[PDB]
Nucleic acid binder design. Structure first.
Length: 45
RNA sequence: AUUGACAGAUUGAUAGCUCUUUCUUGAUUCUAUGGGUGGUGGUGCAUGGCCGUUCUUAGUUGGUGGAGUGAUUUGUCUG
């Protein structure tokens, strides 16, 4: 269910959706938003 | 398996209720069958408890004996 990256062989596995963690992001448009973070987080781009 | 939710959608609603979408939750719960659970739902003509009223008045029982075949009476009475 965390299979959706750009997977690679020998031996690196590169990731997608770059996190900005409070003390992986949803992506529809502009904003990045973190699921687990209890206070909800917004940064447009 | 179920949960928390941004900005729009939708809504009185800064209830993510349900969503167009996509991040998360980590076995608490969901799915159905049986069965519980709860109610200022019905019944005071199924009841308890409490209160009012009959009744602010003076009244009410049984023990032994007497009367009567008996229900009952006498005691509880003329003054």
């Amino acid at each position: 269910v965390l299979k959706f990256y750009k997977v690679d062989g020998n031996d690196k596995v590169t990731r997608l959706r770059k996190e900005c963690p409070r003390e992986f992001m949803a992506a529809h448009k502009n904003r990045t938003y973190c699921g687990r973070c209890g206070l909800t987080y917004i940064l447009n781009a």
